[PDB]
Amino acid sequence: DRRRINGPAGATIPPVYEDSGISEVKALKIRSRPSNIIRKIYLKTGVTPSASGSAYLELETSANSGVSGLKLSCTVHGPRSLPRSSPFSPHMVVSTHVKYAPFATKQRRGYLRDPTERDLGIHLEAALRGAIIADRWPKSGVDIIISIIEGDQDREASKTQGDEVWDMMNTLSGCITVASAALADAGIDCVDTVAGGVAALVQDSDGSPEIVVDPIPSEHRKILAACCVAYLPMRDEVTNLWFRGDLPASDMDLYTELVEKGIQASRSANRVLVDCLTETV
Amino acid sequence: PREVEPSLSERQFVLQALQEGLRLDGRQLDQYRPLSLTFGDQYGVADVTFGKTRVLAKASAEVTVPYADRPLDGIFTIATELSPMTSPTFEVNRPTETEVLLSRLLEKTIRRSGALDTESLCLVAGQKCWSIRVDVHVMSHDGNLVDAACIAVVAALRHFRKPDTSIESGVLTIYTPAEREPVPLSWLHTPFCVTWSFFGDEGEIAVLDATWLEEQVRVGSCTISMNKHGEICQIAKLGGTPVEAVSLLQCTSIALTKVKEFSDLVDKKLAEDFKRRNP
Amino acid sequence: VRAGDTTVLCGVRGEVLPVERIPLFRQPDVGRGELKEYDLLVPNIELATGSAPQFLPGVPPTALAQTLSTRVYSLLHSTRLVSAEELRIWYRPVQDRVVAYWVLYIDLVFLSFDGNPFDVAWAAVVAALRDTKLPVARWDPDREMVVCSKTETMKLTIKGLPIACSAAVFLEKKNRHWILLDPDRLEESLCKEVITMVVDFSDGETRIRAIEKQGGTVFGRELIRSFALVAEDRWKVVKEVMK
Amino acid sequence: RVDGRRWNELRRVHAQIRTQAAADGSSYLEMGHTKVMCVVTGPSEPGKEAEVVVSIVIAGFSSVDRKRHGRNDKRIIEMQSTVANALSASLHTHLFPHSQITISLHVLSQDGSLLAALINAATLACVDAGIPMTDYVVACTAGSTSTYAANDENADPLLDLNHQEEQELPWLTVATLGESDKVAVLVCESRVQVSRLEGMLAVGVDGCKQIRAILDHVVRQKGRRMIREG
Amino acid sequence: TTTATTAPEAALGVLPRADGSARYSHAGYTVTASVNGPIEAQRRDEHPYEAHVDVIVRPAAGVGGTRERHLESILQSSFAQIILVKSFPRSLIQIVLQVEESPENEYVNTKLVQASLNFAVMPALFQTAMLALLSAGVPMRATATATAIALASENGATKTLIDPSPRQVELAQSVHVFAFTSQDELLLAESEGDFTIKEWDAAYETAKNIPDLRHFIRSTMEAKVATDLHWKS
Amino acid sequence: HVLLSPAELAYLHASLSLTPPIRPDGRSPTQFRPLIAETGILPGANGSARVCFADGTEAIVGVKAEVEKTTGEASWVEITVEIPGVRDDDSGMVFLAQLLGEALLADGEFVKKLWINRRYHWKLYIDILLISPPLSYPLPLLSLTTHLALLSTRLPRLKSEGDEDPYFDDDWAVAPYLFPRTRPPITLLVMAVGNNILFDPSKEELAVADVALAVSVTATGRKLRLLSIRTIDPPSRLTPPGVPNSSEPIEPIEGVWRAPRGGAKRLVLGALVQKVLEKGGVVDEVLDALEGVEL
Amino acid sequence: SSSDIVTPGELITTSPQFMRGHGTYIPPGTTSIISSVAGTILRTNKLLSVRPLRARYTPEVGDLVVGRIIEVQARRWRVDVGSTQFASLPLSAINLPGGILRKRTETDELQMRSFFSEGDLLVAEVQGVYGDGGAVLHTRSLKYGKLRNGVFVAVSGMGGGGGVVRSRRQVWTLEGANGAGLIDVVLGVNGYVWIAKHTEDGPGEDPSANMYSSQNDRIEAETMREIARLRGVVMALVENGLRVDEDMVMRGYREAVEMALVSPEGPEDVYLGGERGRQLAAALTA
Amino acid sequence: PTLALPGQLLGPISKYQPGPGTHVHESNLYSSLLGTVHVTQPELPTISVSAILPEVGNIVLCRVIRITPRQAVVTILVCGDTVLDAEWQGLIRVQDIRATEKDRVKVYESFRPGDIVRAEVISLGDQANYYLSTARNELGVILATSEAGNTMYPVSWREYRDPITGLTELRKVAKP
């Protein structure tokens, strides 16, 4: 591009490890965290005073202190005049922009922006737009910008870990939570705080699968299905439901439980979210 | 911003004058503006002036890894981004209908004409290939950019010299000018663009080299790219009011004559420059 | 790196570039040098959308990101901060060859922008590079590719510590002028004239590695000579932060 | 002689009109194995004359090789410019100054003569849409059997070239308003000698006459069935 | 034209269509600058108080990368300090600079995407832009002239190279670019490489008190005005 | 996207809010609109299909299978969605492109089918063309075309073994079906107003939806298997507010439109998916109609 | 003179006796009239014109049209009526509840969105047509104004070719069936159709500040069923090419009502798509 | 002093009347903002939450950015003595500048870009603009800077005078 310092002409290769010993790799990660316990959420508000409201969210990779994984910076921009090319809108226009930080980008040099970044925008847009009162501020717009500082797993490494979709659900859950923190910080009329919960159906043995809150695919041998839920506990409403996984219709109960635990994760995350907002004021 | 238009007085008069067989420049309908071709001190720089239309063009070669359209092939590109210097109507990083067609006509002309030996360009297959970039700078736009640019591009490419290279024990050595004298770029035949314009409401009036003012009044145009030997490398009458095929054949027949004198000029001008380099 | 409200996060990710993929490559004798010939350093600045009101998605884009990137790039090379000797990857059988080069993608993101971007941005670049620990890599002739140890890491031999100091002139226009160190976003909007001074004091004598005055005429030779002392003081305090 | 075809012989050209009910105008056109479907928005408000906006969609399946087409974004933008200018040479855009006409072209299959097919498909849709036209902007291809390098005087121009012929032989696209000699579009990207050009244009113009007979016939067959019922 | 010639060479009205223009060549660098007089500013840069100055730099070859974006900012900030921007509140001033030639570094293979600051070309760009502004008749507070000093070090001595070639710049221990206003004030001071403040101040003297560019600007402008005001008599 | 007046919307919401939902079409909540489709519409494409709704929208999908150098499974398949008049990057287009891919890659069985041998895999190109202008939300139609297309897809039979580069019989009639007669995934845009669940909603209906879900399902009533759910941001949220006759409204005034201000009630989500997966339900109706198309 | 369909570029007549009309053009170098479109040659008063087979609505003064407002402009709205360009609705051309009475007219120009907003439907009459062909609407008759209590459907001859036509009246009120009660119907000559419950402020006739409020009056289920039934009827006519007109709609509605009564699903079922839709057309063309 | 979170229950609609920062849901009143609760206690007691938009009748201070013989376009900065984190454009139509002789008054004689105007919002406008009227004694220019760039002072209601250059300039002075 004209706008960036292009790297070397040749295509650079990401580091490939020596992998000298198979034995050294040894045991596969196992979820020590209880099935109903989310990661430890670190959430801060007002991290970018220049913005009308902002928040920062960070998670321990595997519930290990200091081993940081997901890192999200969110900067809500307060109701502001809409561009004049489309100068009117009866309802406040929630606009969501989600970008992986260059450090978090799948490719250090990329021909195309990740479809994943656009997708997360739509999911987050749907989740937040439900939680935001558009009627309050007609003729105005509000822009929620999420900077995915760090993913819970390195992008090029995630390709090896079964599927990126599970990571995207984890990322989306964080985006919902942090964005809600920023929205509350920005003083944007919201129907209820919305927190992002995620839960999975997993099978790490020949025994029956378990429902697990806030999963990470590396900790499980097989994720049969997962669900991400933007949930409003004070409303008992879901603004954005996202589910993926092959489930027989005979297992409708498991899906129902999977959603409920996913909502339970959202309640758990909302607990941190309210605690952070309460202490903020 | 949007292009400025001539007043309907200017539009009517220019059309009126052409119906009289007269042009505001005093030239005949089938006559070009005084053509000045200047070569810069650096190899590969060519500076063409058609009266008030000036088009500086600089050729350049950089060895680069081959990918995409030419994954192992060696690739020649033309860049002709117009700038406010061309006219305030143009804006940086904002391609236009004029620029896109200008670039499209040039690249088709040079590539389809087979002027360059692409196989000669690749130092190594799938690893390193010479990339021949020619940058076209429209210093002043007074119509017929497609024609002025074509002369500058071919003049630059024929004037341009590659850095010398050598394969030794399989090692590709690329020599800076200090290490070795740059080698001229091999060049089979020189295509030249000719851009007719048509003005009558039935397209019955054909003008050979349009001033910017004329280009705003014309109802159509037809670019023709030809070798000195009569081989047409491309024709582009991309719409506009229709023109009788006999007229277009007349236009091409005349165009060959103009191409021949363009080819003679460039050959002469290159020879004159060559003596300055080697008296 | 946080400097008041301004907050820069710099991340240096190293990637391996095989020589067979490098045009103009030559085996070193052990040109512009490997760093520039091969573009082994790739700094890029992201004025992250919404980091400040002027970077809102609807606001027209500005060149500030590009200018800082090249400012860093040129300063990164002119300071000779990183030596290509460190980035070479050798085969050394047991006929030595360089088989690839480490390419440092030095990405910066302004999480918060409160003015004076270069000082923070440059500090982040230097701080990150000092922290950089590339994995020890070697040529695997059997796999015919460069492979890296999963545990062993080599740290960059960053030489010197060029610290960037900046200031802006505020004019009453007796034409009283106030020199404002680390201009805040608001202050930059009012001060047309700015000065940037990059100094290195690791020799115990201030060495100016770069100067960038522009936008006004208040900063004559006298103030610039005076400012070199101010930059040295800024270097001393920052030196105590970038341990 | 050409495989399964005479030198002065179109491939089976089959077209349909009002192909899609939703579109104000729609056309389907098949020229040999080249398939183009077109849906034209009727002039509608999206300044001196109506804007004609042409969007060409080349489906990946339409190309014999995905790599060959390689996106070809510059090629498509050029084709859209060619068609838009071609149609505007006939459409009475001055009758709808404050409106826009949108032509959407989908290249469902490519077997050469793509530009000619695109222009023909556009006119069929424009006629379907009821847009006042000066005359059918019919298009067709023509290319000397001998190569320009071969320089065979005995060789005579072909018509409606297949994709393979477009790779091997010099070829041209001529679009003529009506049955008239005058040419709205003359795109000849392949190298050809000037002596050959007159023959190719003469053949190409005649091809357009043949195509127009087909196109006009297709329009009437739809027209007759409509007046027969409403 | 070439690097060996001490005398700067310039022309004005080089490009006829432009409001003002100038072609300037010195020390092997040739740049052609077109200036457009206050015109409609695109709403993006329609400042309420003063005209927007929009410097555009186009390299001789390759597409303008980040490097040019910096040059545009450098010249945009300085010329905005020179032009009487207050006189055309909502207007825009285009200053397109086209680098027609620079001394070809015989010791390096062509690289078009290079993003390093090129102090080498800053003086030529500044002079040509200054001439074009004078040609365009844009009101200005003062004229300005730029000079480039490369502090090469040979053996035990430091050697000042004035208006160096890019090859000299890369070999130089440090390079400096000073742009002094007609009032002898400093307008730009871009510098790079290791140097003491004493070395910089020494270069400041070399660039300020020396080809007399002040005279060259005045002499060439005198010739231009004398030529087109010959009628006045 | 779609534009309607608040008074027009108020009627639609009220009509669909009634205990038996009075859809504007007069259609039953369980009932789809008439379906018109074609298979092998494009020759020389391993699978192609055309679908056109009574709504007037149409779409064409073509499937190209190319042997590529690699039981083995990787996301070789790529989906492209050509919408006329979009910038090739719009939210709707990319969201659809990911959504359809999500359905097929949801089980990963589909990836397995495209595995010629351990050395070579079938890289499958799915190109989706919306022939008509996007008058209504394309997702339902695009999914049905993709289902029909994949069903029509035939894969070259392999004369060659696997360790050698694969060699395939050339007869398209000899080439066996992909998804030979699990089924390719169907996806239904399901909508809710109040407690009423609605299927195959019209753009007018979808404009007043309190909840909208894109539910992707497959079969092996039929043995249905849920594959994914995505919440379509109810377009109702972007509609203008109603103006009562002669500030915060305290009451849900009858006949005054008001955009659905919150999320979907937790129970409704269970109801929306429960009704999709009920045996003999809408999915069976859709597959019955879809499987009846000649192939 | 519609013996056969004339086509674009086809010579209609060469003699100078005729004036040209819509769908035809004269090359400047001859007296000949040539058809611009595929259509039927219509001859009246020695003026030759071609009615195209299919063309977007072309307004004429006095046309009663239904359109939804797309834009708000200075003292003007742009109304989509399915024509070649949006019809204009001057702010001076609407029945302000008390524009003179309020003395707020200076305020009114700024608050146009209080009267109509983007997307709002209205029924209006064409008071004029510009040379470019854009219509100018007027809404001062009490029966004209914002449309409420109804459903909107667009007719453009989809498949069946035939669509809405000028008729004795474009607005009527039908008693309705199953105790629906008075429901109005508006057959916008431009192809847009509106079906709503009757109200005294409505466009219909039984056989002012609130005028612009978008609040629907209460509508009972049976009323919505019949309103839906009429909407199905209209589509049934269009999908089979029948003239959509008040006379042909009432015939269809009665047929549909009786069809539902004899149907086993009972009068409650309102569906009319597909074969059942064709069944209505077959019984309606008789 | 009670802190309330978004979605926190405040009480039934029968006990309170929704105020700023609150929203009703199923006959219950909730806080739509993170902020402190406040009850007006005037009919029912209004309840609100405090963690802003211009409104008709509000007095705003704005900066003139461009003037046209018809209307002067200003940027709204302050609404009711409250600075706005985000800004809105407003139009002062020539009719709205002066209380009398609205035909005689000219924009050039009233405001010029850069000066600060205190204006009364007349209406939420079409497109992106508000409509503001300075046709009142308390409304008009507040801060004015001469063509020479000096900060001026109001010599008389018609014109500002410059303390350094001495020149006067015709502008719509705000009387207080």
Numbering used by the authors:
A (entry chain F): 3 to 283
B (entry chain A): 2 to 280
C (entry chain C): 73 to 102, 112 to 175, 200 to 278, 288 to 357
D (entry chain B): 14 to 59, 87 to 270
E (entry chain D): 3 to 212, 236 to 258
F (entry chain E): 8 to 77, 114 to 224, 241 to 279, 308 to 333, 364 to 412
G (entry chain H): 57 to 263, 280 to 358
H (entry chain I): 6 to 47, 68 to 76, 95 to 219
Which statements did the authors publish about this structure?
In the cytoplasm, the exosome is involved in the canonical turnover of mRNA and in mRNA quality control; in the nucleus the complex degrades and processes a wide variety of RNA substrates. The exosome is a modular molecular machine that consists of an inert, nonameric core (Exo9; 300 kDa). Rrp41 and Rrp45 recruit the catalytic subunit Rrp4418 to assemble the catalytically active decameric complex (Exo10; 410 kDa). Isolated exosomes degrade single-stranded RNA irrespective of the nucleotide composition.
The general architecture of ctExo9 is identical to that of yeast and human exosome complexes. Despite this wealth of structural information, several disordered regions are invisible in these structures. In particular, an extended loop region in Rrp42 (Rrp42-EL) and the entry loop in Rrp41 are largely unresolved, while the shorter exit loop of Rrp41 is only partially visible. To initiate the MD simulations of the open state, all missing loops of the here obtained cryo-EM structure were modeled using the ColabFold implementation of AlphaFold2. The closed state was obtained by interactively modeling Rrp42-EL into the unoccupied cavity near Rrp41, a location that agrees with our NMR data. Finally, an analysis of the RNA channel within the representative MD simulation structures illustrates that the closed conformation of Rrp42-EL blocks the exit site of the RNA channel in the exosome core, whereas the RNA exit channel is unobstructed in the open state. The global analysis of dynamics and PRE data revealed that in Exo9 the invisible Rrp42-EL adopts the closed (open) conformation to 5 ± 1% (95 ± 1%) and that the open to closed transition takes place at a rate (kex=kopen→closed+kclosed→open) of 5800 ± 1400 s-1. Rrp42 in C. thermophilum thus contains a previously unidentified flexible one-way-plug that readily allows for passage of substrate RNA via the through-channel route but that prevents access to the Rrp44 active site via an aberrant direct path.
